[PDB]
Amino acid sequence: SDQSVYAMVFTLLCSLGIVLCLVTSVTVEW
């Protein structure tokens, strides 16, 4: 490439990735 929509979708996908990293890291050690 509005850039605000790109930043919003990028932030949402980053936050979902952080949560999924937490779930994977907990589940393997469990």
Short mmCIF file of N, CA and C in Angstrom, two decimals:
data_model
loop_
_atom_site.label_atom_id
_atom_site.label_comp_id
_atom_site.label_asym_id
_atom_site.label_seq_id
_atom_site.Cartn_x
_atom_site.Cartn_y
_atom_site.Cartn_z
N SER A 1 0.83 -1.20 0.00
CA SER A 1 0.00 0.00 0.00
C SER A 1 0.86 1.26 0.00
N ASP A 2 -7.08 2.47 4.00
CA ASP A 2 -6.48 3.35 4.99
C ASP A 2 -5.50 2.58 5.87
N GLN A 3 -4.39 3.23 6.22
CA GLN A 3 -3.32 2.59 6.99
C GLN A 3 -3.73 2.28 8.43
N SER A 4 -4.72 3.00 8.97
CA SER A 4 -5.20 2.74 10.32
C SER A 4 -5.87 1.37 10.42
N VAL A 5 -6.58 0.96 9.37
CA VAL A 5 -7.19 -0.37 9.32
C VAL A 5 -6.12 -1.45 9.30
N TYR A 6 -5.04 -1.23 8.53
CA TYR A 6 -3.91 -2.16 8.50
C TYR A 6 -3.25 -2.28 9.87
N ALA A 7 -3.05 -1.15 10.56
CA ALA A 7 -2.47 -1.18 11.89
C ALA A 7 -3.37 -1.89 12.90
N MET A 8 -4.69 -1.69 12.78
CA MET A 8 -5.65 -2.34 13.68
C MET A 8 -5.65 -3.85 13.51
N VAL A 9 -5.71 -4.32 12.25
CA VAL A 9 -5.71 -5.76 11.99
C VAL A 9 -4.37 -6.38 12.38
N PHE A 10 -3.27 -5.64 12.18
CA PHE A 10 -1.95 -6.11 12.59
C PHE A 10 -1.86 -6.27 14.11
N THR A 11 -2.38 -5.30 14.87
CA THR A 11 -2.37 -5.39 16.33
C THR A 11 -3.22 -6.56 16.84
N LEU A 12 -4.39 -6.77 16.23
CA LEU A 12 -5.26 -7.88 16.64
C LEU A 12 -4.60 -9.23 16.38
N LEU A 13 -3.98 -9.38 15.20
CA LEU A 13 -3.31 -10.64 14.87
C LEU A 13 -2.09 -10.88 15.76
N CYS A 14 -1.35 -9.81 16.11
CA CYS A 14 -0.22 -9.94 17.02
C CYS A 14 -0.66 -10.39 18.42
N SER A 15 -1.75 -9.81 18.93
CA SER A 15 -2.25 -10.19 20.25
C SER A 15 -2.73 -11.64 20.27
N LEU A 16 -3.42 -12.07 19.21
CA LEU A 16 -3.84 -13.47 19.11
C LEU A 16 -2.64 -14.41 19.04
N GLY A 17 -1.57 -13.99 18.34
CA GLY A 17 -0.36 -14.79 18.31
C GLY A 17 0.32 -14.92 19.67
N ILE A 18 0.31 -13.83 20.46
CA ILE A 18 0.88 -13.87 21.81
C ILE A 18 0.11 -14.85 22.70
N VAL A 19 -1.23 -14.81 22.62
CA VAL A 19 -2.07 -15.72 23.40
C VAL A 19 -1.82 -17.18 22.99
N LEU A 20 -1.71 -17.44 21.68
CA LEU A 20 -1.45 -18.80 21.21
C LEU A 20 -0.06 -19.30 21.61
N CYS A 21 0.93 -18.40 21.66
CA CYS A 21 2.26 -18.75 22.17
C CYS A 21 2.19 -19.18 23.63
N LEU A 22 1.40 -18.46 24.43
CA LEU A 22 1.20 -18.84 25.83
C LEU A 22 0.57 -20.22 25.97
N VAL A 23 -0.45 -20.50 25.15
CA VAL A 23 -1.15 -21.79 25.24
C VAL A 23 -0.23 -22.95 24.84
N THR A 24 0.55 -22.78 23.76
CA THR A 24 1.48 -23.83 23.33
C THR A 24 2.56 -24.10 24.38
N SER A 25 3.13 -23.02 24.94
CA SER A 25 4.21 -23.17 25.92
C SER A 25 3.72 -23.83 27.20
N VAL A 26 2.48 -23.54 27.62
CA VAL A 26 1.94 -24.21 28.80
C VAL A 26 1.64 -25.68 28.52
N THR A 27 1.04 -25.98 27.35
CA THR A 27 0.55 -27.33 27.09
C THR A 27 1.68 -28.34 26.92
N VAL A 28 2.80 -27.94 26.30
CA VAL A 28 3.90 -28.89 26.11
C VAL A 28 4.52 -29.32 27.44
N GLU A 29 4.75 -28.35 28.34
CA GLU A 29 5.31 -28.67 29.66
C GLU A 29 4.32 -29.44 30.53
N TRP A 30 3.01 -29.15 30.39
CA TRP A 30 2.00 -29.92 31.12
C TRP A 30 1.99 -31.38 30.68
#
